Design a protein around this ligand. Structure first.
Ligand SMILES: Nc1ncnc2c1ncn2[C@@H]1O[C@H](CSCC[C@H](N)C(=O)O)[C@@H](O)[C@H]1O
Ligand SMILES: N[C@@H](CCCC[NH3+])C(=O)O
Length: 429
């Protein structure tokens, strides 16, 4: 298999970890390293357990020499340091472990400039950039405040590479879905890979303190044991959290960002309306392919587009039903305004890409390298969501007169054809 690995597997033995009731070994799979069943494994069969003595969570960093200096750092920042640190100690309790860890992943945080050019105009590129930058600052602020000061605990220098390394390791390895634990790293069940086969992301791991990894599916001897990293994440999110995406078009998403500008002559009243109904000055709406629009997107759109003619709805009189009206609809002008705004934004966005959906799809038809493959799937996906959105509002523009706006809804209850009320009027005075 692999010397460095052979070592890692031997170490787990001389620790009471890997015993005999452990149906799984390590091997070289298309996705790096994984866990292959040593013999038929059944659904919910405990695969392997790890002693908390071996975690790598804030509780461990706090209980180490640097625990003091990191005493006020954010949970992750603390683990970042811990990791960069232990990776240097020849007497580390994870010497064999780190000697197994991938130096890199296909997460966009490692992509070269050319590799990134393949995501030109994508939302993913934006998101990755932002994240890379943030992590940088936060990490450079760490160097000057903890690494350099305590030159006794941090002997060797520390580059951004080491930082992004630990950050990546953190975001692609740790198990956040756990109660009372959000960033736990477990050297054994670390090698478990992801598969679309697993459709029950309802924790493949439980706490007993120990880490019990139970296989969510029945596996025959020789085959790989997988798990579902996260059903709700988009391909954009999978692409950045780990270095991979799925073919499932339902994983494609594009998030729209709406806000009530302060330059809006009605900012104050509008913001009041939004907040009174669960929305902030700025609001993000995630749009997934083939899903119906998020509730709240249309009403908020109408709020944004409101305008002077209908500003009367922002009056105390309707503060108790305004959202309901926003939910139904305001007026033909309001609707038409917002529809155009969205359609234009979609067209504009669609134009930011350097490839057509056809070209992307022809490429997918050949052999694509890891990162290029990710970029192509991502961009095609986004173009689809973008087009779906424009498609939706194009229909709306057509049905611009089928909707019954505020005024019409008001005159619905007039009772023009009632009784000759004048006969009773004369019986009264
Ligand atoms: N379904 C999948 N397809 C491709 N890569 C995958 C994958 N599931 C997991 N991975 C890879 O493994 C990482 C999760 S940690 C799993 C251990 C890893 N296989 C190793 O050799 O060290 C991901 O960030 C990704 O790079
Ligand atoms: N992201 C997954 C765990 C991935 C583990 C990768 N080895 C979770 O939230 O549980």
């Amino acid at each position: 298999l692999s010397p460095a690995v052979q070592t890692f597997w031997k170490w787990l033995q001389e620790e009471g970890v890997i015993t005999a009731k452990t149906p799984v070994k390590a091997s070289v799979v298309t996705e790096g390293l994984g866990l292959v069943a040593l013999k038929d494994i059944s659904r919910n069969d405990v695969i392997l357990q790890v002693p908390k003595r071996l975690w790598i969570n804030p509780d461990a960093v706090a209980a180490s020499e640097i625990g003091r200096v990191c005493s006020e750092l954010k949970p992750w920042l603390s683990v970042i340091l811990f990791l960069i640190r232990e990776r240097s100690r020849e007497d580390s309790v994870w010497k064999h472990y780190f000697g197994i860890l991938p130096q890199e992943t296909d997460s966009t945080i490692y992509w070269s400039e050319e590799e990134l050019q393949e995501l030109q105009g994508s939302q993913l590129l934006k998101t990755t950039v932002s994240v890379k930058e943030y992590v940088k600052n936060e990490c450079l602020k760490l160097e000057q405040e903890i690494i350099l000061p305590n030159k006794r605990l941090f002997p060797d220098p520390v580059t951004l590479d080491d930082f992004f390394w630990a950050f990546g390791i953190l975001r692609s390895r740790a198990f956040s879905r756990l109660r009372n634990e959000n960033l736990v790293v477990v050297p054994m069940a670390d090698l478990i890979n992801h598969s679309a086969g697993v459709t029950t992301e309802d924790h493949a791991y439980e706490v007993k303190y120990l880490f019990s990894l139970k296989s969510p599916l029945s596996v025959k001897a020789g085959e790989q044991v997988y798990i579902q990293y996260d059903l709700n994440k988009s391909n954009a999110e999978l692409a950045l959290d780990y270095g991979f995406i799925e073919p499932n078009e339902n994983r494609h998403a594009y998030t729209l960002t709406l806000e009530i500008s302060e330059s809006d002559p009605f900012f104050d009243d509008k913001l009041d309306v939004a907040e009174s109904n669960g929305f902030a000055q700025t609001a993000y709406f995630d749009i997934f392919y083939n899903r119906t629009l998020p509730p709240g997107l249309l009403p908020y759109l109408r709020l944004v587009a409101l305008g002077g003619t209908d500003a009367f709805l922002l009056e105390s009189l309707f503060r108790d039903t305004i959202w309901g009206h926003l939910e139904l609809s305001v007026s033909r002008d309001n609707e038409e305004l917002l529809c155009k705004a969205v359609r234009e934004a979609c067209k504009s966005a669609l134009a930011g890409y350097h490839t057509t959906i056809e070209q992307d799809r022809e490429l997918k038809e050949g052999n694509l390298d890891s990162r290029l493959a990710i970029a192509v799937g991502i961009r095609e996906g986004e173009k689809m969501v973008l087009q779906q959105i424009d498609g939706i509002f194009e229909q709306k523009e057509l049905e611009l007169d089928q909707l019954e706006y505020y005024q019409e809804r008001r005159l619905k209850d007039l009772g023009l054809c009632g009784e000759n009320g004048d006969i009773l009027e004369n019986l009264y005075f």
